[PDB]
Structure 1
Amino acid sequence: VEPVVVIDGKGHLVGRLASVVAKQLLNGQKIVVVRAEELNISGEFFRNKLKYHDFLRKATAFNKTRGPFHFRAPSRIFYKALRGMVSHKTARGKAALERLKVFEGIPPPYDKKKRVVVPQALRVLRLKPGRKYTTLGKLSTSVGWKYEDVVAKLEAKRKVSSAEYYAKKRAFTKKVASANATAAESDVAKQLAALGY
């Protein structure tokens, strides 16, 4: 029901997340995806690397600059997985794709916003325990992405700032809960409890 839905991409399966997001964009929901470098693909790392190398094989023989373009970043890998599910050569498909933003890490202003998850695409809820899986950041680094360390350092700095913010918020929440718990005996509180609130 949010005007913009911010999805934390960590722990999600790429195909199922791409399917649900493509349907949301076609229905007309604005979606931002963050932390694409923490996405997961089921199956082993060598298998997924082999599939990407087959994709790398694909190219136009007489002029490589016309051929399929092999974008290495995890956000672009996810974008390819979603563009394959959107009919992107039509005006409707282009308009649906223009309701989507994908980023590595969490840049501003989304670092101060609420981030949600998609349970039907979550790895711990979908995959059977013991099945191997692949991390998108490692796959992208193996196929040529060169910004994993920069993203890691920036994410660590963001995590420190967010931990300090959460500590202050938890102290305030404890104070509010203490102030609210001492008024549970009032007649107003009894009436609200009778009505269910």
Structure 2
Amino acid sequence: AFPSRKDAFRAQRKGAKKHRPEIIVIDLKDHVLGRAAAVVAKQLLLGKKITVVRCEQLNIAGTEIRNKIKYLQYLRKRKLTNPTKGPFHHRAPSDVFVRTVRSMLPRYTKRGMKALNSLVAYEGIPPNVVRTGGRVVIPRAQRHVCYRSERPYTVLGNMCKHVGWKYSDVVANLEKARVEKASRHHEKQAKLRDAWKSARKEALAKMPKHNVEVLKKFGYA
């Protein structure tokens, strides 16, 4: 994680600038857990670097009690002779998603671990990801197109909090502060947004006339 002094020295000798790999950031809020994992697992195997946020807002079909009991049945499975080196049951919603993706990969091959190590999961949206670019969704894994709205569903964070996850309140407080800060920033920069809108509207009267007709033909004016 933390760069070595040799790595920093080599970069300065090369004189290169800041580098960021092409990373897709997925907002997992109101996404079906299984369908999102299957889509993400295939993309990881195709060499994509994927970061998922708001894992605590994933959805599973059924009542919360039914899915809580499902996790508790998974929790009771452990190597009796030595619970260490036994099955490791992770309670955080981001680790639950990571485990779901891992079971959908060839995890016991080097290629499978290369795909798995290309995925980063978070609860909420941490500051290092907030300003990296627009977030994406998976339309075929979204709740409002996947579930019939009459059926009950569970939120992953609510299920995880009652089976051992201890940071439900921390994530909620951090997410509240993030949205207020983003809303305040978005309440500002409105003048900049409207200034460019009027600049595009006023520019129609300054460009050559035949260029306006071309824009109208292709539905841009």
State TM-score, norm by structure 1.
0.94
**2:204–2:212 contact (8 Å) kept in structure 1:** no
Residues 68 and 159, structure 2, Cα contact 8 Å, conserved in 1? yes
Letter of the aligned partner of 1:178 in structure 2?
A: S
The match for 2:136 among 103, 116, 119 is 116
Tell me which of 183, 188, 191 is aligned to 1:168.
188
Cα distance in 2 for partners of 1:183, 1:102 equals 44
* Cα displacement (A) at 1:20: 0.4
Report the Cα distance in structure 2 between the residues aligned to 1:146 and 1:189, rounded to whole angstroms: 64
- CA drift at 1:177: 0.9
1:184 and 1:190 in contact (8 A); partners too:
no
Higher relative contact order by CA 8 Å / sep ≥ 6: 1 or 2?
1
2:39 is aligned to 20
Give me the CA root mean square deviation: 1.5
Larger Rg: 2
Structure 2 counterpart of 1:191, one-letter code: N
Aligned residues of 2:25 and 2:135 also touching (Cα < 8 A): yes
The count of residues paired between Structure 1 and Structure 2 equals: 196
Q: Which amino acid aligns with 1:4?
A: I
What is the Cα deviation at residue 143 of structure 1? Answer: 0.2
Other-structure match for 2:70: 51
Instruction: Give 2:146's aligned residue.
Output: 126
Q: Helix, strand or coil: the match of 2:84? A: helix
Q: Deviations over 1:33-92 (max 9, x none)?
A: 011111111111111011101101101111111211110000011111111100111000
How far apart, in 2, do the equivalents of 1:100 and 1:189 lie? 50
Partner deviation per Cα, 1:18-37 (whole Å, 9 max, x = no partner):
00000000000000001111
1:86-165 equivalence runs, <5 A? 86-113=105-132, 114-165=134-185
SS class of match (2:30) = coil
Code of the aligned partner of 2:200: N
Instruction: Give the structure with the larger helix fraction.
Output: 1
Question: Residue 148 and residue 46 in structure 1: after superposition, are their counterparts in 2 closer, same or farther (change >3 A)?
Answer: same
Q: Structure 2 counterpart of 1:146, which letter?
A: K
Q: Determine if contact 2:27/2:136 at 8 Å carries over to the other structure.
A: yes
**Mapped partners of 1:188, 1:31: distance in 2:** 44
1:186 offset after TM fit, Å? 3.4
Percent identity, please: 44
1:192 deviates by: 3.9
Aligned position for 2:11? none
Gaps of 5+ in 2: 1-20
- Counterpart CA distance in 2 for 1:156 and 1:54 is 33
Which range moved further: 172-181 or 32-41?
172-181
CA distance in 1: counterparts of 2:103 and 2:213, whole angstroms: 52
Over 3 Å counting, the alpha-carbon distance change for 1:176 and 1:189 in structure 2 is farther
